[PDB]
Amino acid sequence: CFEPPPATTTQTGFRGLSMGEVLHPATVKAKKERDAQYPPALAAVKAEGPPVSQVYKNVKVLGNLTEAEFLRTMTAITEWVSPQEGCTYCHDENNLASEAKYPYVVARRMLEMTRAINTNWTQHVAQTGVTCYTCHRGTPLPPYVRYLEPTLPLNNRETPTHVERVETRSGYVVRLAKYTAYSALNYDPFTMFLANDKRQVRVVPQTALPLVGVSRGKERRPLSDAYATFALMMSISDSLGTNCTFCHNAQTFESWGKKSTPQRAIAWWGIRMVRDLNMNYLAPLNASLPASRLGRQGEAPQADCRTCHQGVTKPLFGASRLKDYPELGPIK
Template sequence: MALAVRISTLTVAVTAAALLAGCERPPVDAVQRGYRGTGMQHIVNPRTLAEQIPTQQAPVATPVADNSGPRANQVFQNVKVLGHLSVAEFTRQMAAITEWVAPTEGCNYCHTENLADDSKYQKVVSRRMLEMTQKVNTQWTQHVAATGVTCYTCHRGNPVPKEIWFTAVPQNKRADFIGNLDGQNQAAKVVGLTSLPYDPFTTFLKEETNVRVYGTTALPTGTSKADIKQAEKTYGLMMHFSGALGVNCTYCHNTNGFGSWDNAAPQRATAWYGIRMARDLNNNFMEGLTKTFPAHRLGPTGDVAKINCSTCHQGAYKPLYGAQMAKDYPGLKPAPAAAAASAVEAAPVDAAASAAPVATVATAAK
């Protein structure tokens, strides 16, 4: 009898310890962001913050080089993106990219002995990534503002960014004998170890799907889908936002009405643009590189790595706490003529996106 009691006590203790392991250890700090009693608080864990601070420090920029003299594409061969820079600034930019992306591998990570050679896939990819960076810094300022992005924003000294995503592997139903999990109920880390749909990225950051929680009518009307499954996918994406930025719901939303834009924080509009920026970059830059990458760099279903909020933010409300690295590297914006041309081409998209996001009651999330 005594042995049974001991075993039961031990079982309860182990179970309790396992459950508590998933909770944050107090104390935590709360910052009030609205009226008292409304739950408008931002929760900060000092221990997590202390661990994060060293990882969110931007490297010191070297002085901008002399812009006089011949252009890089007049001196070097096969320079397609940064050719408008002076030779000195081009060399400085290349040195910075090496430190940002491949500090251990060095120039050989992208180049052969013939620097004009394009035989390495890394060089082809990096050229396209420079174009993507230039687009973000000129056409997605609604999201990145004056801070902008650099290669270091995502790479942080690693050839492959730490935070990327691939399309989730479909469930092996084994002739339907084990049931249909319907893309959820697996406690995935990307959705906060909940049972929510574990691939909200394909739905919202690749496909052009509206983020919805509930509808305004008893029965579905029109083409706007706002059912329970859509709500679960939305909450999955919101869990990702929370972890990626190290914030809770009230960073963007007002507890008075999560679906209302009237009292929402400015960060919600920033996130609205961020969703659309991620779709743009995944579809118009990353997807096009699928055949460029070797098989070992593709996901389990053969798709290319893609970006989400964590790719840049990596747990901070602003990447690198808002350090404005891009302003020190003029090559991360396109040549003036190219920038003007791209702005004209993107005018219809930008015109639609520049207007304040319009929300109805059905728009219960970003």
Template sequence: MSMVLRGAAAAAVVLGVGLLFTFEYGSVETVQTGFRGVAMEQNYRASAIPASIAANQLPEPIDRVEPEGELASAVYQNVQVLGDLTESEFLRTMTAITAWVSPEQGCTYCHAEGEELSSDSLYTKVVARKMLQMTRTINVDWGSHVQATGVTCYTCHRGQPVPTGIWFADPGRSPAHGMVGNPAGQNRPAAQVGLSSLPSDPFSTYLVGKEDPGIRVIGNTALPTGNNHSIKQAEWTYGLMIHMSESLGVNCTYCHNSRAFADWSQSPPQRTTAWHGIRMVRDVNAEYLLPLQGVFPAHRLGPEGDVAKVNCQTCHKGAYKPLFGAPMIADWPELARKGPAAPGQSAALGPRVPLQ
């Protein structure tokens, strides 16, 4: 070996040893959640907890108002979603939406300056109307997932016009030729699957359609008795599960018993809540976001030209419950009413299929 290579090797060793003793992860707190010996526990990095708590604080509350005055639909023109609120409730809700979504842009983010408030000339107003319908549907029809906590615009937006955690179809890489074949989105670490080599886009497969796409790792029967669940399905499922773990800041054992991952009878209650959450996300994407495909301008679309969609990260943002379970609809019952549907809006579909 030449002197140059020896010197490079020695430098690499010194650098590696130096890095090994320079960076520390900090202490890890372990909380036992199940019986001893079955690895049912949650691990938390103590140094990361303060930042997570700071990032999941509610904004200053807006004082409640008495439901006074006429209905908003009688006072203002073109109020298609919140027309069942009184004028006082309506103004309070509009003030809150501005603070939740566009605190810097103000009302003109959705209402064109110099035009009547009833004007729909800005695409942001059309989108906001659809999002209000979505918020009410989640609070009314998806208690199986959000329980009595509920959601508001702030759950996702956190003071930003475009929430973090949205996703678009992954264009991937061009299929390789020859023996390498198509990587199927694998072997290129992506943040949404925990920087693993799992398929980087499990969302297009599992979080868009209404029907059960077959989220599972093992088959229901042994081969060759009709079991057609492939290894690729297992890899996509693992990718989605890693995404859920990262989004909620929890281990796999938050929803699964480590002695029998597939067995519902041995799983914690959180698994049922997550099951409903997956179906709620599908419903939100199918009923409220995909229909906006022709509304968003080109610069708000993904590299494949598709509209932004939601996943677990959109609401949870690293917390096992969004905003660590802070009650949302307790202060905003106006967003927990079904209300009138806008023209062309179909009723949201709740979960109607048994657990699998």
């Protein structure tokens, strides 16, 4: 039922406003240990010999690396994505230039996506960056992805209940609730807001009085947009293991300036980045995936805030490998 004291608390607004984090140490420790499994950087290698564009036969992304540099990458990729499966997950034992296994082609696009993240989305990932490990955590299927309908459990490494299974219709409300921090909000924030750029998150008017011409009847946004934004915010908070005051002074959710923390701006960039990733890198990959990876509408698994963050306000508590693997970005 309850969590024993003490609680760790932080301050994120002026004194007296009750803004800041409330954290259970046990829970933080369990997440710290889970995230400390991040494999350490492989030892640096001397840049020696010709570029692998001249040495190997089918190297389209990593072509400016030397042989030892490139094989160091391939070791790191195997550690991050398929340590249990090994190099043969993506490769033919007898022909390392064969694209015959689908993980090869996907991994190539993932290489491009990852460098895109570290080069074009520094407004969100800063100097910390991502690697394949950030999402994959040592398995080819990342533990936290989303379909065009809610699935349970959130961690696909756990085995679903009959009711949790997406085909059991009697369990839909619970599948939806657990994605919105157990609220009864009747909206799926992922397909509404993170799958594409079609919907506006902001719903609150920016004037005191209602403007004539947007304020009556069918000119009005339905109230459901406000439910939906709230649902997105429940989901976002739960995905970072935090509460609203991490980003907002609830005195005025819609105001910036002194009424928002810098984390709110970073979160804003995060919404745009996730949209780019899903629309332009992850959703097109239903062409290249087996039918057992796709959802009930032939969609590929896509990313939300939890995919990288897994319940922590900084993924892997700020761990970085950017300086150790320049080939993953940023790219000049």
